Amino acid sequence: PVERTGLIRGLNKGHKTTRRVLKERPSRRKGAQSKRTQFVRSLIREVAGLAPYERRVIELLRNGKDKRARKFSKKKLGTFGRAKRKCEELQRIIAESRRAH
Amino acid sequence: NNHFRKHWQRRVRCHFDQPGKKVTRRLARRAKAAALAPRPVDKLRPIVRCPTVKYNRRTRLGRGFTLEELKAAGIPRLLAPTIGIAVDHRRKNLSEESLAANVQRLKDYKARLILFPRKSNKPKKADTPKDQQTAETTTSLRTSFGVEQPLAPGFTEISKSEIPAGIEGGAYRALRKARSDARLVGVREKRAKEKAEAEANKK
Amino acid sequence: RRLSKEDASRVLEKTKKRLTHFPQRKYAVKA
Amino acid sequence: QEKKERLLREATAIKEGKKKEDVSKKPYTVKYGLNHVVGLIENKKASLVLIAN
Amino acid sequence: PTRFSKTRKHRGHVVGMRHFHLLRNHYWRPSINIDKLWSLVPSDVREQYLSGQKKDTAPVIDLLSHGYAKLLGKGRLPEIPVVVRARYVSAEAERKVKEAGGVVELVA
Amino acid sequence: GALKYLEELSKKKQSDVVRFLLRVRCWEYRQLNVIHRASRPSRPDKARRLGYKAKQGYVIYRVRVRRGGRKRPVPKGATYGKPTNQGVNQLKYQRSLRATAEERVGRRCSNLRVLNSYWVNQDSTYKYYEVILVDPNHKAIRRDPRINWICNPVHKHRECRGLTSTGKKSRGLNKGHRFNKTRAGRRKTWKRHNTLSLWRYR
RNA sequence: AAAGCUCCUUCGACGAGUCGAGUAGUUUGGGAAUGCUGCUCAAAAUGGGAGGUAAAUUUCUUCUAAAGCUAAAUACCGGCC
RNA sequence: UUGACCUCGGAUCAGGUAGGAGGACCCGCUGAACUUAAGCAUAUCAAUAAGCGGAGGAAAAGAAACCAACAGGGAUUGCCCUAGUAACGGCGAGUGAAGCGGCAACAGCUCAAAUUUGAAAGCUGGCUUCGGCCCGCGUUGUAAUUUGGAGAGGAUGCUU
C-alpha cells in the first residue's frame, strides 16, 4: 500500500500508519469460476440451447451489425454493461461454433 | 417552528418512571452480578479508533477482538467467548499499531485471568492451581480494562535545540500546494500523455 | 400445546460437541 | 433382515475378537439414488447407467 | 404561578446550490486564534514560561487534542518559541509564530 | 448431485424444453382446483433450498391466484370524494400475489404452519405457486431441532403478519439508507418520530 | 470414539420470473438521489449490490441479496396483584 | 390371469389440530373527511380515525448484498444528541430524516448447493414380557460432515 503523506489535504492525505497485508477473506471469492459449476453450466447450455432474443442477437452478430445488436441487447436486458457482456458471450459461442465447423 | 398540527396529545410520552426505571436497572444489575459471580459482569472489549475526520482523534471501546488479534495473542476463537472476551469477526486490522495494542491488551487479560477447573477433583494443566485461585478480583472490566488514554497528550516539552526546521516554503504554502496538486492531478496526466504521443509520432 | 421439556431441550450434535469441549467457564480476573 | 443378520454374525466375531477385515469382504451391489449415481458418472466410476422411463 | 398573572387583576373587567446527503463531519474544523494559544498550556507551566524560568525548553501544543483543527492569527504572541501542531494554519498565524521563534507543524 | 443441474436448468426459463414443460403443466394446473395438494414438489431443488424435506410433516400445496392490480369495491367502480386523477384499474395492492396465495393456503390448512412458497407457473389470468407447510403437531417435526422453532405459538400464521420471505420483502426489512423508513417497522418508526418526549427536568 | 490448535501444493459448490431496466399508481425529507406493488422485458460469473446528479471509459472502497432461528435493554387507557 | 408403481378417492378407521373471546401495547392490509392553505383539483390534517386479518408477555427487528471515505467502525432495539439540520413544498401554508458521538443492554447461529456408497448409519406409528419385534416413511434423499468468520483434502505433534 502507498504510504500516506501526513497532511490533511492533497494526494495520499491522512495520518501515517504501518499498513498491513491481509490474507484474502473467503467472502470475496464470489464471482470466481469453479470447475464443477463451469462443467454444469456448459452441459446445461448444451441441453437447453438459446432464448429467442439470444437467437436474434446471435443472428445480428452473424450479419455483423454490432451496434444494432448492442442496442437490441440493451433494450432486452436493461443495462449497457449487461448488454455488452451478453454480446461478448454470444461472440464466444459463435467462435466455438465456427472452430467446430 | 411549532410542530403541533397533528394529534400530538395522543402520543405524549412523559417520564415520571425515571427513578423507578433506574431502581429496576440497578436491581437487574445486582441479579446479573450475583448470577455471574465470581466472573466480571461484562466482557473484555478492544480499543478502536472512531471513524470520520471529526472523531479520529479519540479512541473508544469496540465490539470485540479480531481473529488476527486472538491468533497473535494465542487464544483460540472457541475458548475466547467462554472466558469473558468479546469476539468480532467483521473487524479487520488494517494497521500494525491497533493490532499490537489489542494483542497487548489480550496478553494483560490472560496474565490477570484466573481459570477454575471444570471438575474440582481433576484440575488440568491449563487451569489455575488451588494455591493461586485466591487473589483480589475485579468485577468491572469496563473500569479495570478501560480506555486509559483516549486522546493524544496535548502538551509536551522539548529542548530548544530540538525545534524542527519545518516544511520548506511554509506550512500555509505547503497546504496550498497540496490542494493545487490534488486539483491538477488529471490535467497534468493528460498533458503528459499528449506530449508522449506527440514525441512518439514525431520522434 | 407447549413443547415437552425433552423436545425443547433436545439439541443438535454439532452444538453438543461444541458444548462438550468448550463450555462456559468459571473464571475471575485479578485486580 | 439380511443386513441385520450380517451385523449379528460380525458382532459374534468381534465378541470372539476376530477382525472385521477377516470376517467381512468388499460388497458388490447396484448403485442407486440420483445424486449418488450422478456423482459416480461425473467421477467416471460408473460402467453402465440405466435411466427410468 | 396563577396568582401573579394579569388575568386575576382583570377579573371583573372582561439560495445557491443544493447539497444532497450533507455530512457535517466532513466540514468539522474548529479554529483557535494565537492570543488564546497560551491558554492551552497548563497554568503553572504557562506562568513559568512567561516569567522566564524555562529558557532551554519549548512547549509543543497539539491542537487536535484540545479539539481545534485550524490555527488562526488574531492577536500577538510573546517572544517565546512554541511548536504548534495543527491540521490547518493561516498565513498570518504562521508568520506570527515564526516571528515568535517557533514552528507550525502540519498533521492529519 | 442432480439438483445443481436442476437449478441451472430452472434459470433458463426461455429454452424449448422449459417452455414446453411450463405450458403442459400450466394446462394441468388450470384443469385442477384453485387450491389443491401437490403430492411432491414440482421444483424439488427450489423446495429443498427453501426448506422442504422428504419427512413426514412436510406438505406441498399448489395454488393459483388472479394476477394484475386491485379494484376498490365502491358502487359502480366510482368514488364520491375529491378527484383522484386515476381510475380503479390502476390501483396497486401493497402485498404480493405470492403473499395472497400463502394466506389462502394457510386458511385452507389452518392446522399447519406456512414455511415458504415459490413461483411455479403463470399465464394471462393466473399466477401459480407452491407453498411448503409444516405440521407443528407431528412428532418428527417436534423432535427435530432444525424445525421445532415453528412449533412455538409466536409463529402462528406467519403469512398473515408478514414473517415469510415475501412479507419481509414487502415490509422492506433491509439494512441501509434506502430503507430508513421501514427497516424497524414503518408504523413503529412513525410513532417514534411523532412521539413528544418530555422529561422531568426539562 | 469424537474435538481443538499449527502449517500447506491444491480444491474451495454459496439461493432466478430473482436481481436489474422501462412504465403506472402509491409512498417518502429522498417531485435529479426513497421504498412497495402491478404489467412488460429479463441477467451474470471476480460476477453482483451499494458508494444520495443523468451518461461512456479507467480505477478504487465496502459488503455478499433473492432460505431460516435467536434473549436483554423498548411499549403497554386490556387482565391480575 | 396375477401382482407392482403413480395419481385420485371413501371410512362414526387410529391419533391429533383450527375456529371463538380478548385486542392497552404489537405485526400487517385497507383507508377518509372536518381542519389548515383567501376559496381550491397539488398540498395539510394523515401514510391518522373508522373497517379487515394475525400474535405474545412482550411483539417486531436482528447477526450486513450495513455505515463510511476515517489513523476506519462493525447484528438488532431504545434514550440523549445529531436537528427543526441536509432535504421536500401551488399562489406557501408547511413538512422533515440519517451516519458519526455518549449511554442502557449485549449472544450468537441453522440450512440449500458435495457420494455414507465398505453397507439409510435417520424417523412416525402399532404390539409388548419394556429386552425388543413388526407395519411403514424415505434413495425424486432421512442421519453424520460443511455455511464464507470459512471449510474440504493432506502433514504434524500435543492438548479436550
Q: Are F133 and F109 in contact (CB under 8 A)?
A: yes
CA dihedral of F163, F166, F171, F172, whole degrees rounded to 10: 120
Residues B50-59: contacts with CB under 8 Å, at least 24 apart: B52/E23, B52/E25, B53/A8, B53/E25, B53/E26, B53/E28, B54/E25, B54/E28, B55/E25, B56/A15, B57/B151, B57/B152, B57/E64, B57/E65, B57/E67, B58/B150, B58/B151, B59/B147, B59/B149, B59/B150, B59/B151
Q: Is B97 left (phi over 0), alpha (psi -120 to 50) or beta?
A: alpha
CA dihedral of F191, F193, F195, F200, whole degrees rounded to 10: 140
Q: What single-letter DSSP state applies at residue E14? A: -
Other CB atoms within 10 Å distance of the CB of residue B48: 17
d(CA D52, CA D29): 18
B54 C-beta less than 7 Å away from strand G: no
Residues 85-144 of F with CB under 7 A from strand G: 85-86, 90-98, 116, 118-119, 122, 124, 127
- Cβ–Cβ of B13/F198 closer than 8 Å? yes
Find how far residue A83's CA is from the centre of its chain.
10
- Give the residue ranges of the annotated binding site of F for Mg(2+): 80, 84
Nearest CA in chain C to B141: C29
Q: How far is CA C3 from CA C11, C15, E67, F149, F153, in A?
A: 14, 20, 59, 10, 10
* Burial grade of E15 (CB within 10 A; 0-12, 13-18, 19 or more): exposed
Choose the mutation target among F187, F194, F202 for the interface with B, i.e. most B CBs under 10 Å.
Answer: F194
- Give the residue ranges of the annotated binding site of F: 80, 84
Asked how this structure was determined, the answer is: cryo-EM
Q: Which three cell numbers stand for residue C10?
A: 433436545
Nearest CA in chain B to E98: B170
Nearest CA in chain E to B51: E25
The closest nt to A20, taking CA to C1', is: H71
| Nearest partner of B82 among C14, C27, C17, judged by Cα | C27
Q: Can you tell me which residue has its alpha carbon closest to the C1' of nucleotide H40?
A: F82
Question: Residues 6 or more apart from B129 whose CB is under 8 A from it?
Answer: B123
Q: Which three cell numbers stand for residue B103?
A: 494483542
Q: Which three cell numbers stand for residue D10?
A: 460380525
What resolution in angstrom units was achieved for this structure? 2.6
Q: What single-letter DSSP state applies at residue E37? A: G
Sort out which chain B residues have CB atoms less than 8 A from A18's CB and list them: 95-97
| Nearest partner of B59 among B47, B67, B68, judged by Cα | B47
Sort out which chain A residues have CB atoms less than 8 A from E106's CB and list them: 6-8
| Nearest partner of F164 among F54, F53, F50, F70, judged by Cα | F50
Sort out which chain B residues have CB atoms less than 8 A from F196's CB and list them: 8, 11-13
B194 φ, ψ to 5°?
A: -65, -40
d(CA A98, CA F10): 28
Residues 137-196 of F with CB under 7 A from strand G: 149, 152, 154-155, 158, 163-166, 168-170, 172, 174, 176-182
d(CA F147, CA F134): 9
Q: Which three cell numbers stand for residue B124?
A: 488440568
Question: In the block, which residue shows the cell 472476551?
Answer: B85
Helix (H) or strand (E) holding B12: strand B12-14
Sort out which chain A residues have CB atoms less than 8 A from E62's CB and list them: none
Question: Residues 6 or more apart from A91 whose CB is under 8 A from it?
Answer: A61
Give the side-chain half-sphere CA count within 13 A for C20.
7
* Burial grade of C13 (CB within 10 A; 0-12, 13-18, 19 or more): exposed
